[PDB]
Structures are given as structure tokens and as C-alpha cells.
Chain length 139, copies 2
């Protein structure tokens, strides 16, 4: 398994509107979690969840954002025995599949939310299940 | 897919020490989430997560706890098209596999926690990743 991971901003999910998104490259399966801020520890929390969902990957591709190049994240990945490659934001080889997942997720979130009567932000108490439904639907 | 679901109390995970545990009967895969209280909505939040991890099941077996027999939970399951069977707490046919999962999970949580130097409660900031690690290890 080789994953692509990024963060994408989704105000429908505010306050925890920073979505950490992983796509498994061979299967196209997605894992998404919500966060208040993009940080090294948010990335690590996200991947911990993703490992529990998909298994432990051999490698993860990210961009060169601080949250991915930090000593903390380097060490977390090493502790897990997961290889890491980084490129510039949006590079195709390492980020095009996760960027597609971002777009698919945002469209799905919008459609579900609007279907439930939410034309703008999703009420806080409804976000977790809606996000899980979007993940289910896409996978 | 037929699941067995229950709640089990794990003080190492306090304050959100109520663990909602699902086992997929054919694969023995487990999904676990943390909760502060056993409620109908906690069960629903748990299953929403479980569907995102395992897929939508045909049926779920639980005990006859309030959180499972409520109008709210009946309706949530119906909305999802998931059949439900209930029995007395601990009944074998519908709860023995999830009770085994409870025991496997609690042992794993203890071993991981003690390995990290936590002889009693796990620090709050460390619980989510430790729980995800336990789920990964068991699956």
C-alpha cells in the first residue's frame, strides 16, 4: 500500500473544517478526519485512524507542508516503519489522486448536507455522521 | 455482514471510558469508538463510524439495553435499512463474539498502555492513537 495524504479546507464542517484526506492509491479507498488546525499532530492523528481503517501502508506521499516535513512527523512515520516521500503542493505523481479525492469528498458533503436541508454550515452535532456517510458513499 | 455490538467500560480511557465495540461475525474484524455515556445517539455515532470502516451490514445483534431498544435507535437502523435483533445481556448467539472482542481489546489496551509507561489512566491526549493502534493490532 502506498497512500497519498493532504489537508483540504471545508467550511461546511467548521469549526473543525480542516479535512485530512488519505487515498489508498491502488484501491482508491479514502479515509477522512476533521481537524481544527493543520498541525503535525493532526496529521499523525489522521494517519493513526487511517491505519486502523486500511492497515499499515508501506509508504505515504505528501506535499512539503510543515506538518509533513517536521521532525515530529518524520519521527512518527519512522516509529511506524512507514516510508515517506514529499513533493511540491499539487505535484501530480504524489498528489493528483488525493486532490481528486478532495473534490469527490467536497461534492459529496455538499450533496448530503443540502439533502438534509443545510445550505451552509452543517450543524456541529450532525457533522461526524455526515462525514462518515460521505466516506462510506465514496468507498 | 452480520455484526454484534455492545458497550464495555474501560477506565484506562476515561473520561470517555465507554467503549462501543462492534465485531463483524464472519471476519472477526472489530471497530471501537470512545464515548462519555451510553446513549442511543452514542450507539448511532459508533455505527456510523463502523459503516465507514466495514461497509453497511445486513443486520446487527445487540442486547436489550435502552440505547438499542429506543425509538431513536429503531428509526436510525430503519433509515439505514439494517435489520436488528436483540437478546438479553450476554446471550451467546448474539453477544459471545463481541464479549470476546471486549476482552481482547481490554487486554491489548492494557499491554499498549503499560508499554508506554501508563500504569493507570492513559493521558487524554494519547488515548485516540492508542485505541486506534489496539484496533489495528487486533484486526
Amino acid at each position: 500500500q502506498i497512500w497519498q495524504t493532504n489537508f483540504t479546507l471545508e467550511p461546511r464542517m467548521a469549526p473543525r473544517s480542516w479535512l485530512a484526506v488519505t487515498v489508498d492509491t491502488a484501491s482508491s479507498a479514502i479515509v477522512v478526519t476533521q481537524h481544527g488546525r493543520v498541525t503535525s499532530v493532526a496529521a499523525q492523528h489522521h494517519w493513526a485512524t487511517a491505519i486502523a481503517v486500511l492497515g499499515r501502508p508501506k509508504a505515504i506521499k505528501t506535499d512539503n507542508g510543515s506538518c509533513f516535513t517536521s521532525k515530529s512527523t518524520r519521527e512518527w512515520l519512522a516509529r511506524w516503519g512507514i516510508a515517506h516521500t514529499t513533493g511540491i503542493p499539487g505535484n501530480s505523481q504524489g498528489q493528483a489522486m488525493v486532490e481528486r479525492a478532495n473534490r469527490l469528498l467536497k461534492d459529496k458533503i455538499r450533496v448530503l448536507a443540502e439533502g438534509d436541508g443545510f445550505m451552509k454550515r452543517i450543524p456541529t452535532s450532525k457533522q461526524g455522521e455526515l462525514l462518515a456517510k460521505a466516506m462510506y458513499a465514496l468507498n
